[PDB]
Structure 1
Amino acid sequence: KVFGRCELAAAMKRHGLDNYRGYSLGNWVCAAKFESNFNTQATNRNTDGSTDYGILQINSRWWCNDGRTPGSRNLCNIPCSALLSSDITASVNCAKKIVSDGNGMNAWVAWRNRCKGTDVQAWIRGCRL
């Protein structure tokens, strides 16, 4: 599924991401935009044998199990395929653990490259949240 910007914004706020660990909703929508362009089916194979899954591109090496990643750990205790559903619940709860893993949102490279230090409030424009 492909979310509309405000539609995803609402869904994320509904799952408690607004200001989670001090990160405004704008940060999460912006991260989603550049990590997967709001596409829940998004997947990116990495040259290290791992794969990034879903709207927030969660990595298979440490967070989810896709059964084909060497020395993988399943810290979020879920199959990676669950991160490709139309409902973001699974991705959000896993993301909540990642953001608290000691690097803030720096865990998402696209956030770091395109959202960090920017006026992320714009990503929430027009939204009746």
Structure 2
Amino acid sequence: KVFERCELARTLKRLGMDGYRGISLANWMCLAKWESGYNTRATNYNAGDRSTDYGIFQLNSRYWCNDGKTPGAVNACHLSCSALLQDNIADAVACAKRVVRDPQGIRAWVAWRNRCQNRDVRQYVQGCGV
């Protein structure tokens, strides 16, 4: 599913992401935008290390979910990577929450540092009623 901006903003808020571990809703929106374009079926294979990024938050199979073909993988979210490809993003959200519970927080995603950190991210939630 390819979410529309405000549709996603309202969904994330209802799932308790606003201010989760100190991360504002606009930051989560900026992250989803640059990672997948708000697309839940997005997948990206990393030929260099044999891992794959799954879903709207592009969660990596080496640490967050199990796809069975990634070497030295752990499954911290205890989910099959298939769960991160559903239209319902509840599982993807529960896993993103786990990621930020680690020391790096939102910085775990390099895309956030390049495209969101220290920027005016207000635009991502403007007019969505959240």
Please say whether Structure 1 and Structure 2 have the same fold, judged by a TM-score greater than 0.5. yes
* Residues 60-107 of structure 1: CA deviation (Å, up to 9, x unaligned): 001100010001111110000100100110011000010111101111
Cα deviation, 1:7-42, whole Å, max 9, x if unaligned, reads 010110011100111111000000000000000000
% identity of equivalent residues: 60
Structure 2: segments with no counterpart, 5+ residues: none
Structure 1 gaps of 5+ residues are none
Which residue number in structure 2 is paired with residue 36 of structure 1?
Answer: 36
- Counterpart residue number, 2:84: 83
Tell me the residue number matched to 1:8.
8
What is the number of equivalent residue pairs in this alignment? 129
Give 1:58 shift.
0.3
SS class of match (2:72): coil
TM-score (norm 1): 0.97
Q: Which residue of 2 aligns with 1:24?
A: 24
- Other-structure match for 1:124: 125
1:117 & 1:88 partners in 2: Cα distance?
A: 27
Q: Tell me the C-alpha RMSD between the 2 structures.
A: 0.7
Equivalent residue, structure 2, for 1:51: 52
